[PDB]
Design a binder for this molecule. Structure first.
Ligand SMILES: Cn1ccccc1=O
Ligand SMILES: Cn1ccccc1=O
Length: 147
């Protein structure tokens, strides 16, 4: 029926159907369109107190809760989708990863290099698409597939 990971869902507020991807946590009104050795992604990471290393270039000691981190991720997604903010600008300013200095770019990678939820979401994204919140031991990620 639909591409890998996608399923139909029902909007509680509006009653209109939408599409949700359980690998990438992406959700959208439009029916999704239509695997490579390598993909290229950028990401925006929000760390929290249970992160594998609760530190970043932004904060020596990261104290926010997982729930607080998810709220921040949700808000960044809203601003990217409305177009008030660009993914790359938010990543440079707010990502808790060293890759913030490269507008979130991680370069290209193969399967078996990244943490598995990040890998699976990256390879289920189509070129140019963006994930919802993706959870790993580092924190909570927004992922943008660029190649
Ligand atoms: C095809 N399509 C169109 C608009 C937003 C998302 C998407 O996947
Ligand atoms: C997202 N990411 C970045 C570096 C190493 C592993 C990983 O999952």
């Amino acid at each position: 029926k639909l591409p890998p990971g996608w399923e139909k869902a029902m909007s509680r507020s509006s009653g209109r159907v939408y599409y949700f991807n359980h690998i990438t946590n992406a959700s959208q009104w439009e029916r999704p369109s239509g695997e490579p050795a390598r993909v290229r992604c950028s990401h925006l990471l929000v760390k929290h107190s249970q992160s594998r290393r609760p530190s970043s270039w932004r904060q020596e000691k990261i104290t926010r809760t997982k729930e607080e981190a998810l709220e921040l991720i949700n808000g960044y997604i809203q601003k990217i989708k409305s177009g008030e903010e660009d993914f790359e600008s938010l990543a440079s300013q707010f990502s808790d990863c060293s890759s913030a200095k490269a507008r979130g770019d991680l370069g290209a990678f193969s399967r078996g290099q990244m943490q598995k939820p990040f890998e699976d979401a990256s390879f289920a994204l189509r070129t140019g698409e963006m994930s919802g919140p993706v959870f790993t031991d580092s924190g909570i990620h927004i992922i943008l597939r660029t190649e």
